[PDB]
């Protein structure tokens, strides 16, 4: 079980680019890209509902 | 503190394209090379 609703996408991504920042190696931004490909589809629910996706995305991360 | 701030972090991300492509050119490593751009211009003010 697992409470979704871009949740679970949000989630996952922080702690993508919290371990880059000490296994920086040559794959630093392969980790970055992750992290930035997984908060999609929660600017993907915001274009379709309307909302602004920066301010959403913002406060889910702060 | 704002929406062109966020704006003006891609800008200056897109015009590092410049050096990326001279070591791509030149054959050595874009990170490697970008790396020691960082490395070395906090205190190098010019020149480097």
Do not use: C
Request: proline share 3%; no cysteine.
């Amino acid at each position: 079980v697992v409470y979704g609703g871009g949740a679970a996408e949000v989630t996952m991504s922080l702690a993508v680019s919290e371990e880059a920042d000490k296994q920086r190696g040559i794959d630093q931004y392969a980790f970055r890209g992750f992290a930035q490909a997984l908060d999609t589809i929660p600017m993907t629910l915001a274009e379709n509902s309307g909302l602004d996706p920066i301010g959403t995305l913002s406060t889910l991360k702060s | 503190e704002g929406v062109q701030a966020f704006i003006w972090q891609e800008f200056a991300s897109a015009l590092e394209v410049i050096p990326t492509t001279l070591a791509e050119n030149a054959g050595l490593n874009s990170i490697k090379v970008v790396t020691e751009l960082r490395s070395k211009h906090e205190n190098g003010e010019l020149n480097d």
